[PDB]
Write a protein that binds this ligand. Sequence first.
Ligand SMILES: Cc1cc2nc3c(=O)[nH]c(=O)nc-3n(C[C@H](O)[C@H](O)[C@H](O)COP(=O)(O)OP(=O)(O)OC[C@H]3O[C@@H](n4cnc5c(N)ncnc54)[C@H](O)[C@@H]3O)c2cc1C
Length: 480
Amino acid sequence: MPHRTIHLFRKGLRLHDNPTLLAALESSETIYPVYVLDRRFLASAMHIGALRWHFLLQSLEDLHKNLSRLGARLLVIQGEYESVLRDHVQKWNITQVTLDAEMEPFYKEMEANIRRLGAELGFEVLSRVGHSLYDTKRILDLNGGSPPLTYKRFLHILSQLGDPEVPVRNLTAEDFQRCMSPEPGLAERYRVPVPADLEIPPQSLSPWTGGETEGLRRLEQHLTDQGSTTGLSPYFSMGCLSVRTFFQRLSNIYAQAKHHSLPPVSLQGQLLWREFFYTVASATQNFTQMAGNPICLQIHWYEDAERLHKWKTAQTGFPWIDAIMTQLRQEGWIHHLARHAVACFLTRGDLWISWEEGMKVFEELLLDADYSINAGNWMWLSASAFFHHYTRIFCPVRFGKRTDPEGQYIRKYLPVLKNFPTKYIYEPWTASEEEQRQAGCIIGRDYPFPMVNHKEASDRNLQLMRRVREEQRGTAQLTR
Ligand SMILES: Cc1cc2nc3c(=O)[nH]c(=O)nc-3n(C[C@H](O)[C@H](O)[C@H](O)COP(=O)(O)OP(=O)(O)OC[C@H]3O[C@@H](n4cnc5c(N)ncnc54)[C@H](O)[C@@H]3O)c2cc1C
């Protein structure tokens, strides 16, 4: 097998169900498994917070360990990807570069530039899809060339298409005996960087740890506990876990239960929601912004950086909202309906700030930040597309009360409020100043007053949204 190959990890930080890396190994006599850490590229394409950096480095550490157990290695190269390739195609006499066929525009542009470099330097480029359950193009073709714009229509097209693609086999020590992974000269240059190399605090405090190994453990620990959700989203978004592998595992449980257990089928539905947004995002221009986006309602959101700042820094004065944003910032993950609460509050519900700004904050702070899922759900929660019950607005006081009447979640993440009686824990501004003194927390000093009046703001915003939907009837109809 002739090729000397670089495989470029970008997502796909796993060895199970990795069709591109498998294709690389089957076609090559020597291989260099590489992650290019390109700060200039990421600076131009992404917003990445400290917790996300920690999860990436942990996932790279684990990938290095798993490759090393098979007689190989991970090579982390720090630089601009074009210069890195010019240098290392020469150093390693490369004839093939492999990389996953990611759908993100910034990844597609990188891929286009790498293909152009291959035409110049003399390497072929091979890609396989490792991020989706289905061949997205097949879904588009069955729907006449355009993506389904409702989940119902999406499911109808999938029922014509059939089952998802199956995972490919695991990689083995024999693969790296047939296709050798040489230790390069100057190998200390290729170590996984440590947090201080990225100027981030050294200790990661997220209850999440990156990597394929922890992803697989968590997956199996969830199914055993089932005998709160999976908490697997960061592993799917980073590629530490294959959605095809998880889909098939759920099918295995359904089969062994003689088709009598529907909970695994419900969880398969969560991955179909992921696939829905990936499919729309892959075939919709300007998907992650409002202007020029053909399915997005055009809404003149306020430019009010101070409102955004208060929301982002958990200083809205609504404890339920600030507690969620605090868990997001400190841990990097929040429950689906917690995301509903704060996204509705920021956009159509209260602050009337663009969903694009909420998306960018979530991108920075979420371990599971995902181009397609995040944009799709932010359009949903702002009632810009997909969701149309705009007279229904989450109450930033009452919603948590049903869940957690005593406010234990609030007291955990906002300990300044920990001594407030539950009668005030969701609306501490209604306490008298003397009750505030007794709780040790003066509103406006230790914890802010509420930044809007929810009743007045949501009333305002309902009238604004109604004008939008009465005028842009055709746009709203696209996703209903
Ligand atoms: C405003 C907003 C922004 C969001 N941004 C993201 C994001 O950047 N990345 C992300 O992975 N999810 C995002 N979500 C979706 C959802 O909240 C998370 O997928 C889920 O909370 C992750 O927890 P889990 O793995 O326990 O989910 P589970 O319920 O265990 O679901 C299993 C998997 O299915 C997928 N999934 C579940 N719900 C959805 C959904 N509504 N849409 C798409 N895929 C779904 C995820 O890959 C998830 O890991 C967003 C939701 C909202 C409302």
